[PDB]
Ligand binder design. Structure first.
Ligand code: FMN
Ligand code: FMN
Ligand code: ADP
Ligand code: ADP
Ligand code: SF4
Ligand code: SF4
Lengths: 684, 684
């Protein structure tokens, strides 16, 4: 490797092992935990062979008192968990990588809703944080602490038996007993485990020493540690420095992380690349040992920076690794222009928070590797001589055309408007969504290296043109329009709209049209990002803006992306009125009628204009026109794709297109069958 | 069987099969879907053994387009699911009952977050109801309806293979495609599946006929249908009546239920027993087939009335059957005083919505039958001649005593107060909570029939007493008190409280004390029921009330028990102000300072009094004392349980009490091991 990037491929000693390079995939969930272990093995194996030197598993509950149901992570309670763990460690090895396992006791943060065990913590407190479950933790005695230590030790043993190279002590994200013992916020103990740094670090020390003694140099010991909590009384700079000074010589590796998962995986919308830096700068100097840090790292020169300036030894990533499993190899090979950069959407997390195998906006193969055999980079050779027309160049069209391109097909990509990108382009122009543009960039950067793909950019297409042009196969990727009649979830049918009121939708704002008068009401019955984003826009542009939502919070689905609090603070700071728990039930000439969701009390709200952000209808005129022409015999295949088939997130659109690409000319089972593989429960 | 109740023990023909009696357990979820098949088997067998003539599984997804993850129900996608379904039906049979299977396709209610397949519905809409997933359902074509019909046919085949006696076409709760086709709220179609009632009923007709053909005298065909949806253009009395005029003679059994699950499983806090009669009356005359219905039926007289008045043929029950699997046998045998009545807490539902095996406040063995060997009625016999002291007659100590009592142990139950029941008594007295006393009545009923248990009211106990009387084995069920320092989740350490202000906790209210002046602030950081119920008590007494809570809704955890909307509604009607998204960060002499949770903005709120509803500290002074004395060789054993151990719900305390009793005198595995049996994933 050369240029300035050779720095990123130096070996690093971690205890008795050596990395091939400085790329480190840190522990991250996957929504396919104790429940889809083959799925995980396949994925982790792909990260390894993509160039990540160490590959970590998500956290792994060491004991049934660490039950965090409904969350589905990995488990190491018993020898019954071994075969699953061993497969993952095996798959990473055979992929060329060192395997990491993040042993975890969630302590006071485990509600134990499934095991029905008592949670254990430093104090008698409601289970916390990131949960409001009606259960309290019991304060641990010395005997309980000794019990915890033994469970941890058993878990480490079993990690050696499974073949892991790196075994963590986990003390990060408010999710660990160890963090709760460290933090003045949860530890108000008065015995030797509380009261002062030396004491609050006691448990940490003990778990470290125990893990070391138990490994006996057959594995390395990592410690993943909270470095900044971002709350009063929480872990600060002073604490982390004291820990490093006393214990810095103890593990084989120090992984640095935020005291909060909200804080750790913040979206691009709310944070730039490498923001963890000024919480971590200065810490390397304190330890003989190597250091990993994160910072949504996508730019290879930012990675170069982190190492030359002595902030980090390993470049850690979670999400960058999900977006592009092959990021290390693309840097290796000089093809930097082909890096699929994380968008920082958070969609990946929402899989975990909805106990689904995590989706990536950028990488449709995430969670398809085992079950459908998809690959982040490769796709089967073309099975035919076909010429395919993809109509519409939004996320779904772009990905169909990219993937069919990569297969070797002769593909013509037709686009109606001046620009490529569809909703990605219209959406990234919105406040705080600039990075989303990257979905379009990667696809263009790869399309450019495909001579077999023709792109035509000011070319609307009708069923007529397609037949006249003689196109035998079409993929119809035409998108969706935003309803203006007020229908989504609260109304399933049009609400009444007086003739005198200006009513716009997102199509109008994307087209550059803006409300006429000063006061605007945005009716948000979508509950994801767009309502809030549109309202941001209007207020920046000088309008007086109210959001009306049937939810108790604006953009309530963002609970699933950890954005919900940030969204609300951001709305309150732009002076936007949050009119939550209300539906718009009438639009009159000079205002709207809102109805409270709980008691149906109605009120008038005066305004000069109304912007509807509710739901969408597919652009399927072309498709239905072509199905008619297929039945008649004038073409051989049409397939609807993306938002024109059934509107969803951008990720779903991207996925939708890759699916069409992988399925083109495939001989398929009838749809009676499950279109993927799955593991099922082992009967006793 | 005694002469009033003998009618409930008459055989009822259900296609090819005959019930032993009229007790029918309707479909209900359990949080052990495809994940824990054996647990469910043990639970369904016990129900059959309890005298329930038909026992049904929860809804079974028939296809991967019907994926309702994160909810974890059963599946029948294909043959890999058969071993698991076959075990459930064999268990019911071994139990002596008929096995039902609720085959269901969720259509547009299926967000498909795990399958990533396109949801299917009568039109292009966002997935609904009760989900805000960013995904829309595709409008089915005739070809999609033929596909669906075929998938349902396949599932019926497989149901018969697995050995089920009754097979449902499911059209209820707004959770199936059948209901969305049937309801004008979701069906706006103009082809043969919409417009007239004849048309919207057509899918149902078609699935009914197909299911009957496929069955062919091998299984009975049940139809579970929405009789009232409780919303504007939804299904109503004229709709179901017409369905019955035309279709009444098709299925073998009609199962009548509500049009939303909020509507169907209504808490007893919000609805009396038999609430669904205003809705099913008159429908039985329109069909010759047997008819099942639910009403949270716990009163045997109420049951005799349903049958005698021609309302039902079968007494349907979900939650009453969870609270008491052995309810039919108790009535048969004439032991009506031993029935454990549902309290209408919905704590069970909370299992489904948090993807955990369901708990029941009344029945701590629900969820434990397989994994720990518990039984709702049988406890294994005493293993020694021991004499046990149980201090505290709250839920915890009552169930321990009752359980130890049934084993044959000599037991002494000492209680400090005039009353038994502890928090059950104190809390039952609160508005809407009276049914919760049934927790105590049940245990009193069984204790009355146990000469080997002795109960001392008005007997506060101390360390010296106990040792003095020469008790060897003590269970300390002493409870917890509610904190008045402001600590729970938002604060982990005390907030500042001015000397001049009156501050009350729930313990004061239970004791008879009420705030001194007219204006009251309730700080609620408990997030479950008590704050809102406390606020309702005060409004009812003439106080002017404000509830301040960091959640976006008052009682936010009641999202999990389907009361959250009802609760906000009831607070508005009582004129209680909802200061949501706020914490109390200071209590001054004539008001409080509140801090907005998002943007950190503080207002003052003036009041004459503050009632703190936050969290709890255990009353464990006695246990700590006896632990000392145990280590002096003065007693042989002590165990803290219930809220004295770690505060929780009433259900957790009951469970805790039963756990102490099942565990008594047993040889236990080290706590290193998993305290229960458990199934893991089958590696492929
Ligand atoms: C889908 C998702 C799941 C993750 N789960 C965990 C976890 O199980 N263990 C943990 O310590 N960190 C977990 N994290 C945090 C990551 O390890 C990482 O510290 C964080 O995502 C920031 O790094 P990034 O910018 O590379 O994403 C999770 C983050 C992601 C994206
Ligand atoms: C834990 C829980 C799970 C349920 N799940 C389903 C279900 O899978 N399908 C359905 O038909 N009804 C389900 N229900 C509704 C019940 O079948 C029943 O109609 C409702 O609980 C009212 O009857 P009850 O008053 O006897 O509880 C569920 C209810 C509860 C208690
Ligand atoms: N008849 C048509 N011919 C060519 N392109 C079209 C036609 N109708 C729509 N388009 C283009 O299809 C694209 C749809 O993209 P988008 O709205 O992002 O959909 P998706 O989210 O499915 O990718 C838009 O860029 C639009 O300009
Ligand atoms: N020292 C004592 N001796 C006897 N009874 C006690 C003593 N301390 C507390 N109790 C009783 O124990 C009961 C605890 O009930 P409760 O608070 O409902 O706990 P749980 O929910 O665990 O049952 C109360 O009725 C209280 O009077
Ligand atoms: S889903 Fe979004 S935030 Fe997650 S890895 Fe992919 S691009 Fe990054
Ligand atoms: S949890 Fe409550 S409502 Fe449910 S079956 Fe038990 S007592 Fe009944």
């Amino acid at each position: 490797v050369a240029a300035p990037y050779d720095v990123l491929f130096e070996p690093v000693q971690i205890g008795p092992f050596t990395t091939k390079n400085r790329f480190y995939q840190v522990p991250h969930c996957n929504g396919m935990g104790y429940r889809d272990p083959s799925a995980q093995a396949s994925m982790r194996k792909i990260k390894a062979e993509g160039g990540w030197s160490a590959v970590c598993t998500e956290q792994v509950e060491i004991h049934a008192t660490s039950d965090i149901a409904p969350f589905i992570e990995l488990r190491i309670w018993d020898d019954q968990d071994l075969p699953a763990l061993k497969r993952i460690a095996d798959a990473i090895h055979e992929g060329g990588g060192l395997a990491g396992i993040e042993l975890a006791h969630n302590g006071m943060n485990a509600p134990n809703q499934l095991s029905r065990e008592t949670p254990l913590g430093p104090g008698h407190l409601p289970v916390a944080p990131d949960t409001i479950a009606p259960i309290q933790a019991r304060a641990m005695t010395k005997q309980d602490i000794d019990d915890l230590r033994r469970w941890h030790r058993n878990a480490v043993r079993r990690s050696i038996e499974a073949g892991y190279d790196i075994v963590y002590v986990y003390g990060a994200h408010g999710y660990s007993g160890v963090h709760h013992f460290l933090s003045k916020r949860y530890n108000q103990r008065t015995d030797e485990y509380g009261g002062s740094l030396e004491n609050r670090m006691r448990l940490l020390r003990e778990l470290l020493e125990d893990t070391l003694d138990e490994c006996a140099g057959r594995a390395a010991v990592a410690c993943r540690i909270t470095v900044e909590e971002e709350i009063d009384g929480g872990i600060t700079r002073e604490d982390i420095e004291g820990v490093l000074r006393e214990l810095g010589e103890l593990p084989d590796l120090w992984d640095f992380a935020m005291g909060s998962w909200e804080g750790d995986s913040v979206t691009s919308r709310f944070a730039p690349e490498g923001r963890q830096e000024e919480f971590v700068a200065g810490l390397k100097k304190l330890t003989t040992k190597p250091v990993v840090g994160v910072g949504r790292f996508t730019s290879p020169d930012a990675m170069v920076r982190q190492i030359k300036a002595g902030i980090l030894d390993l470049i850690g990533a979670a999400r960058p690794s999900i977006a592009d499993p092959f990021l290390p190899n693309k840097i290796r090979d000089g093809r930097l222009n082909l890096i699929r950069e994380c968008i920082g959407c958070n969609i990946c997390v929402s899989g975990d928070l909805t106990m689904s195998p995590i989706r990536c906006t950028q990488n449709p193969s995430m969670g398809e590797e085992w079950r459908r055999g998809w690959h982040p980079e490769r796709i089967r050779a073309k099975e035919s001589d076909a010429r395919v027309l993809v109509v519409g160049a939004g996320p779904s069209g772009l990905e169909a055309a990219r993937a069919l391109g990569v297969r070797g097909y002769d593909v013509v990509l037709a686009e109606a408007g001046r620009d490529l990108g569809g909703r990605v382009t219209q959406e990234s122009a919105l406040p705080g969504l600039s990075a989303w543009g990257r979905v379009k960039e990667y696809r263009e950067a790869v399309l450019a290296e495909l001579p077999n793909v023709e792109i035509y950019r000011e070319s609307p297409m009708t069923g007529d043109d397609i037949v006249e042009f003689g196109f035998e196969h079409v993929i119809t990727a035409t998108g969706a329009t935003w309803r203006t009649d007020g229908v989504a979830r609260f109304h399933t049918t049009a609400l009444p709209i007086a003739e005198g009121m200006q009513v716009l939708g997102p199509d109008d704002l994307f087209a550059g049209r803006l409300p006429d008068g000063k006061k605007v009401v945005v009716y948000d019955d979508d509950h994801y990002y767009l309502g809030g984003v549109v309202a941001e826009l209007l207020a920046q542009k000088g309008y007086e803006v109210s959001i009306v939502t049937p939810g108790a919070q604006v953009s309530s689905w963002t609970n699933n992306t950890f954005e919900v609090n940030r969204i609300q603070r951001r709305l309150i700071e732009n002076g936007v009125a949050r009119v939550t728990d209300h539906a718009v039930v009438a639009v009159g000439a000079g205002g709207v009628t809102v109805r409270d969701t709980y008691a149906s009390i109605e009120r008038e709200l005066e305004c000069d204009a109304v912007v509807m952000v509710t739901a969408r209808l597919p652009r399927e005129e072309l498709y239905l026109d072509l199905v008619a022409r297929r039945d008649a015999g004038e073409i051989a295949s049409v397939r609807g794709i993306g938002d024109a088939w059934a509107p969803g997130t951008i990720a779903a659109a991207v996925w939708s297109g890759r699916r069409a690409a992988e399925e083109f000319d495939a001989v398929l089972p009838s749809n009676d069958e499950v279109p993927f593989r799955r593991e099922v429960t082992q009967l006793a």
